[PDB]
Design a protein around this nucleic acid. Structure first.
Ligand SMILES: [K+]
Ligand SMILES: [Mg+2]
Ligand SMILES: [Mg+2]
Ligand SMILES: [Mg+2]
Ligand SMILES: [Mg+2]
Ligand SMILES: [Mg+2]
Ligand SMILES: [Mg+2]
Ligand SMILES: [Mg+2]
Ligand SMILES: [Mg+2]
Ligand SMILES: [Mg+2]
Ligand SMILES: [Mg+2]
Ligand SMILES: [Mg+2]
Ligand SMILES: [Mg+2]
Ligand SMILES: [Mg+2]
Ligand SMILES: [Mg+2]
Ligand SMILES: [Mg+2]
Ligand SMILES: [Mg+2]
Ligand SMILES: [Mg+2]
Ligand SMILES: [Mg+2]
Ligand SMILES: [Mg+2]
Ligand SMILES: [Mg+2]
Ligand SMILES: [Mg+2]
Ligand SMILES: [Mg+2]
Ligand SMILES: [Mg+2]
Ligand SMILES: [Mg+2]
Ligand SMILES: [Mg+2]
Ligand SMILES: [Mg+2]
Ligand SMILES: [Mg+2]
Ligand SMILES: [Mg+2]
Ligand SMILES: [Mg+2]
Ligand SMILES: [Mg+2]
Ligand SMILES: [Mg+2]
Ligand SMILES: [Mg+2]
Ligand SMILES: [Mg+2]
Ligand SMILES: [Mg+2]
Ligand SMILES: [Mg+2]
Ligand SMILES: [Mg+2]
Ligand SMILES: [Mg+2]
Ligand SMILES: [Mg+2]
Ligand SMILES: [Mg+2]
Ligand SMILES: [Mg+2]
Ligand SMILES: [Mg+2]
Ligand SMILES: [Mg+2]
Ligand SMILES: [Mg+2]
Ligand SMILES: [Mg+2]
Ligand SMILES: [Mg+2]
Ligand SMILES: [Mg+2]
Ligand SMILES: [Mg+2]
Ligand SMILES: [Mg+2]
Ligand SMILES: [Mg+2]
Ligand SMILES: [Mg+2]
Ligand SMILES: [Mg+2]
Lengths: 79, 177, 115, 66
RNA sequence: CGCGGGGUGGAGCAGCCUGGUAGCUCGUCGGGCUCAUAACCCGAAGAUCGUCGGUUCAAAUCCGGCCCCCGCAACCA
RNA sequence: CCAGGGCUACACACGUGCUACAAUGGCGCAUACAAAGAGAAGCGACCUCGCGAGAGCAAGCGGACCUCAUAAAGUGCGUCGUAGUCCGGAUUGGAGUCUGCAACUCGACUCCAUGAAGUCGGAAUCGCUAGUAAUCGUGGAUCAGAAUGCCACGGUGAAUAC
RNA sequence: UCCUCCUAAAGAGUAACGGAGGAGCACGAAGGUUGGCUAAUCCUGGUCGGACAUCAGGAGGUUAGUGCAAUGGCAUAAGCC
C-alpha cells in the first residue's frame, strides 16, 4: 500500500471526528471521504460511508484502523 | 519399565493428595493401550492390509490382529467376516515401554503439534489419540512406506470419571491444551 | 535430512533442499547457508550430522511451517470477520488484488462450470 | 508372548541434538537420532508466543508516532 | 370384475421375471463449418427407473398393495 | 457547477495477445558486439544511503558533446539429469517504494513468503517466398502515475518454392 | 403332493374355491466330540471416516443368532469360535 508520510484523512473528517469524540457518542456521521484512513480515536463511532447511492453505517472496531473507510462499504451489488 | 517404576515410585503419591483417597488401590492405574488401524481400503487391494500390519508390528513390539467386519453393510461394500482393519492390544511391560516412546519421542514429531485435546475423554477416564501419519514414530524408514495410513491410540484406565482420569495422564507430563 | 517440521530430501543440493520447507524460498535458503557456514554446492547426503544441527537453530529464527500457516490463516480469517472488501472477496472465491473478473480469474474462481 | 511370530524387540539408545540421552526398547536396529523430545519442544513457550500475535492499534501508532 | 403382460434422460427403445453394472438411436445445450440457415464435424449435459411399502448387507431388476396402460376373456341357455 | 460511485461488475461465450509447458533449457559467476529515438514545472550523472522499488545532495545538456543507457539473445565456466522438476510463476498473506489533493473500490513497481493450471493442445485453423518467418532485446508517441497494446529500431537468422 | 400358523370350541383329531406363508433342497463340515466364548440397538470418545467399516468404554439383557418358511424351542445354550 501507498503513503509513508502520514496516514491520510480529510481535514473535514478529522475536525468532525475530533468534535464528535470530545462531545460524546451521538449518531452516524454522514461522510463521503472513503479514501480517508481510520484513526484509533474513531473506535466506537458508527460513521456512515457513501457507497455510491446511499450511506452505509460502519461501527468501527479495534481491527478497523490501518484500513480505509471505503473498504467497509461495497459499491457494486451482485446477486 | 521406566514409566512403570515412575508410577510406583512417584505418581502413586501425587494423586493420593488430590482426591484424598482412602487406599492405594483407589488411585487410577493404566490398564492397556489399544492401537487400532482401520485400514478399510483393503477391499480393493489385499496386500494393503499386510502392509499396515507390518507398520503396526513395527510401531508396537508385538504383531497385530487382523480384525474382521462385524456386520455386512452396503455403504462401504463389505461382508460378514471380511478383513477390514488391524489392531494391537498391548499391555503390561511393553505397554509402559511404548507409552514412554509415545509421549517422550513420538508426540513431539507430530506435524506442528501445538496442544493435544484434554476434552477427548469417554466420560470414564479412557483416553483416545489419533495420529495422522506413521512417520511420527521413529520405527518406520522414510523410503519404505508409500501411503499415509494413520492409526489411533486408545489408553484404557481404571478411573470412574474423565476428571479423575485426566490427572493420571497429566501426572506423566502429558501435553494437554 | 529431518529439520524443521518435515525437510526430508536426498540427492539434492542444500540450497534447493531447504526450499522444500514451507516458509523458506530461494533467497532465504542462501541466508541460512551463509549464516550456518555451509557451501551451497554440497548436498545433504554429503553433509555430516554435526552441520545439520546448526541448520535447525538457523531456521528456528524464521517463522516456518505451521507457525506460518496459522499466521496466514489468521490474517485471512481476520479479513473475513471484518467484512471489508477484501474479506467479501475471499469468502466469495474471487480475485482480490483489483484483478479482472470477467474473462479470466480461473485460478481463484476455479475451473469452468455450466450455465 | 508367542515366540517366533513377533519382530525383534531389541534395546537401543535415543540421543537428540538437545543433549537428552535416553535408552529405550523398539524395533529399529542399531542407533537413533532425534530432533525434539517431551523436553526441548516449544509447547510451554509455543502457546505464549502463538496467542499474543494480534495487535492492530499499536501497529498504526508505530507508523504515525504522533 | 378374471387373465397375462407393461410403465426407464425431452421422444422411441435396450438393460427388468438369471439381485451390486444404466446403454442405443434421435432431440437439447457448447464450440466449429458457411455470407448466413440446414446438412455435416468435434465436445458436453441430461433418467435415482409409475407411486407407496416390504424382503435384503444392497431392489430399475425379488414380493405386496394402490394409480394409469395395452392385449385377452365376460360363454350354454 | 460539486462529492461520491461507475466505465475495472461476472454462472458464462468468443476475439486478439503475452507467459508458459523446459535440457537447442533453468539459475549463478567471467565478460564481449547494435540501431533508432528522446529531454527543460526537462532528462537527471558522479556520489552517498539502502536486500530492492527508490531516497537525499546535486554534474552536465534545449544536445554528433550531457543524460535515460550495462542492449539482450551470444560466447565462457559452473550446477541441476527428466521431475509437475532448480520447469512454469499464476494466486494469495505480510512489508514496502514512487507518482499524485487522494491508490479501499481501482494504479504501477519492489521485497519476503506463497508455488495454481500446464507434460505441446478436439473439430477446426492462421501468418509467412529472405535479412522474410522465427526469436532476442531496444526506443518513442499518449502520458503526473498507469503497456503483454500501438508505432518505430536494430541483434542471430533459417527451412521451402516439383 | 409336502411343511408351518390360525380357523380348531385349553387332550387328539376336525371342513369350505376360509385367512397368511413356505418346501421339491443345502452341508465332508453347516456332522461327531472335547475346550473355550456370548448377542441387537444405541450413547460417548477416537486418522482419513460419512447416516453406517475398524478400536475403546459404558448403557442394555437376547430387544439377537440359529443354512431356507413359520410355529415350538434353545444360557447347561440347540447360538459363536
Ligand atoms: K368327524
Ligand atoms: Mg439488489
Ligand atoms: Mg518453500
Ligand atoms: Mg519469490
Ligand atoms: Mg489493474
Ligand atoms: Mg445413455
Ligand atoms: Mg449446436
Ligand atoms: Mg420423466
Ligand atoms: Mg433384513
Ligand atoms: Mg441398482
Ligand atoms: Mg472500456
Ligand atoms: Mg475488477
Ligand atoms: Mg486494467
Ligand atoms: Mg509467442
Ligand atoms: Mg522467462
Ligand atoms: Mg536462462
Ligand atoms: Mg523458476
Ligand atoms: Mg529462479
Ligand atoms: Mg552516467
Ligand atoms: Mg546508472
Ligand atoms: Mg557515508
Ligand atoms: Mg549496495
Ligand atoms: Mg531516484
Ligand atoms: Mg538509483
Ligand atoms: Mg538527439
Ligand atoms: Mg551516458
Ligand atoms: Mg529507457
Ligand atoms: Mg547514445
Ligand atoms: Mg526417471
Ligand atoms: Mg499440485
Ligand atoms: Mg520445486
Ligand atoms: Mg496438474
Ligand atoms: Mg496434468
Ligand atoms: Mg509446437
Ligand atoms: Mg483430423
Ligand atoms: Mg523471452
Ligand atoms: Mg518494448
Ligand atoms: Mg517518453
Ligand atoms: Mg512487445
Ligand atoms: Mg386347536
Ligand atoms: Mg386341539
Ligand atoms: Mg377341546
Ligand atoms: Mg370332515
Ligand atoms: Mg404355494
Ligand atoms: Mg440334498
Ligand atoms: Mg473343523
Ligand atoms: Mg454337536
Ligand atoms: Mg448398569
Ligand atoms: Mg430372535
Ligand atoms: Mg420370522
Ligand atoms: Mg452343534
Ligand atoms: Mg451351539
Amino acid at each position: 500500500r501507498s503513503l509513508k508520510k502520514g496516514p491520510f484523512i480529510d481535514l473535514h473528517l478529522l475536525k468532525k471526528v475530533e468534535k464528535a469524540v470530545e462531545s460524546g457518542d451521538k449518531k452516524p456521521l454522514r461522510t463521503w471521504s472513503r479514501r480517508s484512513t481510520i484513526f484509533p480515536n474513531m473506535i466506537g463511532l458508527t460513521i456512515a460511508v457513501h457507497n455510491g447511492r446511499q450511506h452505509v453505517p460502519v461501527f468501527v472496531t479495534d481491527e478497523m484502523v490501518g484500513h480505509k473507510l471505503g473498504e467497509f462499504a461495497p459499491t457494486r451489488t451482485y446477486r | 519399565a521406566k514409566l512403570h517404576d515412575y508410577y510406583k515410585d512417584e505418581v502413586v503419591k501425587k494423586l493420593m493428595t488430590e482426591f484424598n483417597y482412602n487406599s492405594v488401590m483407589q488411585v487410577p492405574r493404566v490398564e492397556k493401550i489399544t492401537l487400532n488401524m482401520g485400514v478399510g481400503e483393503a477391499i480393493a487391494d489385499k496386500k494393503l492390509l499386510d502392509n499396515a500390519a507390518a507398520d503396526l508390528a513395527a510401531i508396537s513390539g508385538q504383531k497385530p490382529l487382523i480384525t474382521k467386519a462385524r456386520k455386512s453393510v452396503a455403504g462401504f461394500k463389505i461382508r460378514q467376516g471380511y478383513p477390514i482393519g488391524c489392531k494391537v492390544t498391548l499391555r503390561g511391560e511393553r505397554m509402559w515401554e511404548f507409552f514412554e516412546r509415545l509421549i517422550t519421542i513420538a508426540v513431539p514429531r507430530i506435524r506442528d503439534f501445538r496442544g493435544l485435546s484434554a476434552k477427548s475423554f469417554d466420560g470414564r477416564g479412557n483416553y483416545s489419540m489419533g495420529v495422522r501419519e506413521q512417520i511420527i514414530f521413529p520405527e518406520i524408514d522414510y523410503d519404505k512406506v508409500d501411503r499415509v495410513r494413520g492409526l489411533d491410540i486408545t489408553i484404557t484406565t481404571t478411573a470412574k470419571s474423565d476428571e479423575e482420569g485426566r490427572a493420571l495422564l497429566a501426572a506423566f507430563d502429558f501435553p494437554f491444551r | 535430512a529431518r529439520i524443521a517440521g518435515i525437510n526430508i530430501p536426498d540427492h539434492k543440493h542444500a540450497v534447493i533442499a531447504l526450499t522444500s520447507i514451507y516458509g523458506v524460498g530461494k533467497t532465504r535458503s542462501k541466508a541460512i547457508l551463509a549464516a550456518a557456514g555451509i557451501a551451497e554446492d554440497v548436498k545433504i547426503s554429503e553433509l555430516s550430522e554435526g552441520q545439520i544441527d546448526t541448520l535447525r537453530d538457523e531456521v528456528a529464527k524464521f517463522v516456518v511451517e505451521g507457525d506460518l500457516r496459522r499466521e496466514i490463516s489468521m490474517s485471512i480469517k481476520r479479513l473475513m470477520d471484518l467484512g471489508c472488501y477484501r474479506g467479501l472477496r475471499h469468502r466469495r472465491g474471487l480475485p482480490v488484488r483489483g484483478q479482472r473478473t470477467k474473462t479470466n480469474a480461473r485460478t481463484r474462481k476455479g475451473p469452468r462450470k455450466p450455465i | 508372548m508367542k515366540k517366533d511370530i513377533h519382530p525383534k524387540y531389541e534395546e537401543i539408545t535415543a540421543s537428540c541434538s538437545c543433549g537428552n540421552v535416553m535408552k529405550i526398547r523398539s524395533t529399529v536396529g542399531h542407533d537413533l537420532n532425534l530432533d525434539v523430545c517431551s523436553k526441548c519442544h516449544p509447547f510451554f513457550t509455543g502457546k505464549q508466543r502463538d496467542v499474543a500475535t494480534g495487535g492492530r492499534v499499536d501497529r498504526f501508532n508505530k507508523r504515525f508516532n504522533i
